[PDB]
Design a protein around this ligand. Structure first.
Ligand code: NA
Lengths: 216, 103, 103, 103, 103, 103
């Protein structure tokens, strides 16, 4: 659907275009990402957080990015790299009041609808639309369902969540049933990131090859 | 001149409009002798073909056959929604005469 | 030699610019004999074609007609914003003589 | 006409269906004289070629061979899951006759 | 043989290297008769063309002019940085002999 | 018929393998007469041409040269990891006989 998420970020539009998108600070673990300490807005352990509304992300910047003259609130389209943190971590969600939606891998540049500017903690009335934004593609897409994230929860190997529903039925080998659990959570996330990035390259590089004219 | 696919399609006998509003499920392609052709499917089992260039096709049609195989391959890969296909139903699989793509 | 699409279009009789500043809403392609063409629309309903190659065109234009159909497809599937079309206004739908993309 | 890739393969002698369901691991292409070809591999080791054009091929096959190499490069760069190849098993490596892409 | 664009440009008389180091602001192509050309610009106002094929081009150049119009269209659409253009300064706008792109 | 780029390269005297495991850093393209070519580079400084269609090419080698320039252009813009290049080490800069792409 055409839904949209929101993220305060110190990094300006030009650096984001240069990096290919909104990248995380490679460890991939959703639990560590979510409980990570927050001078810059949650982008640790292989993920980058966002918020459900434009007003809840503005507030997020106005605590974390207090002491920044200028930051940005990037408006992001929803795609199946996003995970609802409260849905995937259940009662063990460390900061449930934040209503997080974390992009495993980052938010590619095509996924970024645009960005508001913020000066001395005041929002810009209007949006800077992104020339690389893809409205049709990303509007036929949605957040990943919680079932895709339960196996990527990233709970410690002997956490009680791994012997509890829904997580037992998605639990990586070594997680409640050597670093087997830790290495598998990493690799299952590296695979999920690899297959999502495969799918976006399918979308964008196929368009770049809608060039071809066999007959000519 | 027709302004859309439905009206273009109705100029031709033994055609019919298929309204799918879905991305192509699978794309097949062959270079085997006498079978230099393409074949798409959709979720629901619907199967269609770009015909082998033969005796039913004029020269301007052979150019556009090669183009349709380009369009269809790349439309499959982009996962573009296909509104409608005008097809010929005197063949099996139904042979594509036109396609329209839209959100 | 012209510097932009607006000045190019002003060199021809029966042409006019149609500014769209919008991506293509739909792409329609046909290999039906004597309707080997493309038809694009936009969200506002505006409709254009790439003519079927006929006697109205010179030799060098044929290569360019096929090029333009390539452009419209890649423009459609990459969601590129179309700036302007130069079109012949004495066909229905209006027939694309040129295209600019920007912004 | 055959309804799908498996039917198409059953029409020729010296052929078989290879069922991959994986992206292409490696795309190789050569312009070196008398080795004008492609070669693809998958992570199970399976290696295939698009044969250099020769006297085994009829004239209509010339175009489809060029398309197929295009198709394999597009498929590689897009990491498109290849469902099945129809392959001539009388060559080493097996020579690609047709391809289907799904999921 | 020349190693880079600047060395290649230096072989031909009546040329100059423009360093742009920017993606292309606009791409424009025409299929209208006697103006079968492309025209690109940059944010700073620099305009360039790929010339209409004519008697100044030998036959080897013909397929390269078509390759260059492909390159400029997909350069624009990808938002790829054009480092430099080698251009004939004797035409208005300056005609493109070559292009380099760098990250 | 070889199953990979290393063995294919070894069939020719006057070739050698570079293994880059790296994307292309720059793509260059010329339509200037008698230098209808492409040039690529890498981070490590390494430079390669696709030769101008000249004297020491056949007929079917002319088509594969065009396909190779297609390959390098799209590889450059997709940031495709080039595994290896088999190159004619007696041209300066070395000219690409083949490419392999994995990763
Ligand atoms: Na969405």
């Amino acid at each position: 659907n055409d839904d949209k998420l929101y993220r305060a970020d110190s990094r300006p539009p030009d650096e984001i275009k240069q990096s290919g998108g909104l990248m995380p600070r490679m460890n991939i673990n959703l639990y560590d990402h979510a409980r990570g300490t927050q001078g810059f807005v949650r982008h640790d352990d292989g993920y980058v957080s966002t918020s459900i509304s434009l007003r809840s992300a503005h507030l997020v910047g106005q605590t974390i990015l207090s002491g920044h003259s200028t930051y940005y609130i990037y408006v992001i389209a929803t795609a199946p790299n996003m995970f609802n943190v409260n849905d995937v971590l259940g009662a063990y969600s460390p900061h449930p009041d934040e209503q997080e939606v974390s992009a495993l891998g980052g938010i590619p540049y095509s996924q970024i609808y645009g960005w508001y500017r913020v000066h001395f903690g005041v929002l810009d009335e209007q949006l800077h639309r992104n020339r690389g934004y893809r409205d049709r593609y990303y509007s036929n897409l949605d957040i990943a369902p919680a079932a895709d994230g339960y196996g990527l929860a990233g709970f410690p190997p002997e956490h009680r969540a791994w012997r509890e529903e829904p997580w037992i039925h998605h639990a990586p080998p070594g997680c409640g049933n050597s670093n087997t659990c830790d290495e598998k959570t990493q690799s299952l996330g590296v695979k999920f990131l690899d297959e999502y990035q495969s799918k976006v390259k399918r979308q964008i590089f196929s368009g770049y090859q809608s060039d071809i004219d066999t007959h000519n | 001149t027709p302004q859309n696919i439905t009206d273009l399609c109705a100029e031709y006998h033994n055609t019919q409009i298929h309204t799918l509003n879905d991305k192509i499920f699978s794309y097949t392609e062959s270079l085997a002798g006498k079978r230099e052709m393409a074949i798409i499917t959709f979720k629901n089992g619907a199967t269609f073909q770009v015909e082998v260039p033969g005796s039913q096709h004029i020269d301007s049609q052979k150019k556009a056959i090669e183009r349709m195989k380009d369009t269809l391959r790349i439309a499959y890969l982009t996962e573009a929604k296909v509104e409608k296909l005008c097809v010929w139903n005197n063949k099996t699989p139904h042979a594509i005469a036109a396609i329209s793509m839209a959100n």
